[PDB]
Amino acid sequence: GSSGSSGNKITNLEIYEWYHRNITRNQAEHLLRQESKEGAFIVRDSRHLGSYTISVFMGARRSTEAAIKHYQIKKNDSGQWYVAERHAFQSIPELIWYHQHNAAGLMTRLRYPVGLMGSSGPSSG
């Protein structure tokens, strides 16, 4: 089971921008699609569980199509978050703290930290 508690939680992500909360698969990807540039990454919650998933834009090879990956952040017995299942951290905002400078997990070096306030994008129709 999963039931929150009374009051605000210690962990604060909303403060950041790369932490896209209150979104869904479509949103995560959609946002990246707008950037369509290697690096565009983000962080959302797993409607399934109280976890967090990182959505990065890989982009096709011949820049002809779009590519978006989804790295689910799991936790080990040591209650540490990890994406590459090789480097465990103590806080969510800590795992990406380094990654940004150096992936360190067969992942692209985050370049464009897609934040809540997106740059700009046209509307369907």
From Swiss-Prot:
Residues 18-114 form the SH2 domain. It is found in: Cytoplasm; Nucleus; Cell membrane. Expressed in T-cells and some myeloid cell lines. Expressed in Th1/Th0 cells with IFN-gamma-producing potential. The cysteine string at the N-terminus is palmitoylated and required for the proper subcellular location. Belongs to the protein kinase superfamily. Tyr protein kinase family. TEC subfamily. Interacts with PARP1 and EEF1A1. Interacts with SH2D2A. Interacts with FYN. Non-receptor tyrosine kinase that plays a redundant role with ITK in regulation of the adaptive immune response. Regulates the development, function and differentiation of conventional T-cells and nonconventional NKT-cells. Phosphorylation leads to TXK full activation. This is Tyrosine-protein kinase TXK. It comes from Homo sapiens. The lineage of its organism: Eukaryota, Metazoa, Chordata, Craniata, Vertebrata. The gene is TXK. The chain holds residues 140 to 251 of 527 of the full protein.
